[PDB]
């Protein structure tokens, strides 16, 4: 995307939001991030929601292939999972690749330093949750240090009921449940952070309440599930 | 369990 | 896909379709047709599938986009409808080069010949959708021409009740009402359709019941919209 | 106006 313009490409982005082409979406916010400059809060959302769609798509039909694979077990059924796992492999390592050169360096506020470090943790999970080979281990720990730092900034740097804090701390409870078999500290994650954002939740305008209850309601959601 | 869903903004 | 057999080409559509993957799905219908054998029943019905799917979220996306262009009237939404637009062109072409190259010439039996040219309607009648310039009026003829061969094929050699040959007159009832500009014509026809399929259900069994009122359903939906 | 749904076989 290198002979169009910035501006032209995040307009396209939102158009095909419009549209639900998000393999458009996300090769539009790639061309955006590769003119090097930073990128503004809502610059950051059609980024992560054009990558977050399209290895959504890609992960749910991972698990339908798969799953018809564990019933089996010719070599079709594996052959075409082994194809989507690594179609879904190629776009974790090009957003990873996006946010080492250079959007993780260049972020210096907390909130998009924050961003970009849950962002990181959350495809490195998206790679662990199809690793099984040598570096899976290491998949898991790379997702584990994104997470991790992330958490460690908004916790000194963000209030309780900031939603990019609280989506943090859910998708890192997901990891821990999911990824890292301690379902122990997903629930106590999802338990302290719930709590002290609702005790937050008075300092707050009518639509910053709106913003966090919701994503509150996602960790509540989860608790159900896990207890 | 539930991500955050992220796929509409 | 000239180095996979046919069989797993075939085997892979069909996890690509549970998989919701129809862009893969019509990749590998597209490599069992050229592999130069006519296509069962069910083939027939894979390959109008993949990329019923195909076209179909690229028609809707077409026509997203080119509402906010007449809400409009810089270049970037047009620039991207034109986009679309030409990948949604380049899909029917293929899928008409198929047809022409040379499954239709191939076709002998009254199912598989009227299932192909309603095909061709089908996608002419997408390149209608969207033709302006000096071919709009040939590109239309060239759909009426293949679902009146169709229809005349039909009413020859198949039921009333014959699903395919309710679907037929379905569509081409679409192509009267919404491209030729002829609602008396498109209204006429669903509605001697639906009637002459009511006289003739008494001869099915319970399966086949079920399958022709549920296009019957389809022709009365329309009516409904059209009176 | 419908056409065959057609989107799933
Ligand atoms: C990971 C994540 C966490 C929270 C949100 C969210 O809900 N936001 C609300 C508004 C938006 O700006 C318009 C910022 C993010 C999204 C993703
Ligand atoms: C264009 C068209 C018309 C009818 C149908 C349909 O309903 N079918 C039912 C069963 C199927 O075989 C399993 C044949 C087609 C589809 C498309
Ligand atoms: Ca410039
Ligand atoms: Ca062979
Ligand atoms: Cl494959
Ligand atoms: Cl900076
Ligand atoms: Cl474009
Ligand atoms: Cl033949």
């Given at each position: 995307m290198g002979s169009m313009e910035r501006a032209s490409l995040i307009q396209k982005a939102k158009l095909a939001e419009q549209a639900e082409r998000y393999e458009d979406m996300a090769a539009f916010m790639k061309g955006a991030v590769e003119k090097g400059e930073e990128l503004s809060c809502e610059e950051r959302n059609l980024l992560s929601v054009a990558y977050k769609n399209v290895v959504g798509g890609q992960r749910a039909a991972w698990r339908v292939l798969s799953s018809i694979e564990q019933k089996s077990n010719g070599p079709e059924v594996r052959e075409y999972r082994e194809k989507v796992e690594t179609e879904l492999q190629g776009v974790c390592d090009t957003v990873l690749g996006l946010l080492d050169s250079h959007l993780i360096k260049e972020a210096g506020d907390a909130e998009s330093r924050v961003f970009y470090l849950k962002m990181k943790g959350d495809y490195y999970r998206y790679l662990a949750e199809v690793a099984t080979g040598d570096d899976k281990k290491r998949i898991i720990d790379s997702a584990r240090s994104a997470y991790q730092e992330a958490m460690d900034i908004s916790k000194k740097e963000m209030p309780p009921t900031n939603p990019i804090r609280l989506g943090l701390a859910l998708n890192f409870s997901v990891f821990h449940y999911?990824?890292?078999?301690?379902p122990e500290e997903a629930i106590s994650l999802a338990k302290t952070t719930f709590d002290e954002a609702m005790a937050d939740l008075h300092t707050l305008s009518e639509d910053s309440y709106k913003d966090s209850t919701l994503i509150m309601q996602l960790l509540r959601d989860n608790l159900t599930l896990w207890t | 369990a539930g991500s955050i869903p992220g796929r509409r903004s």
């Open positions: 999911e990824i890292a078999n301690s | -």
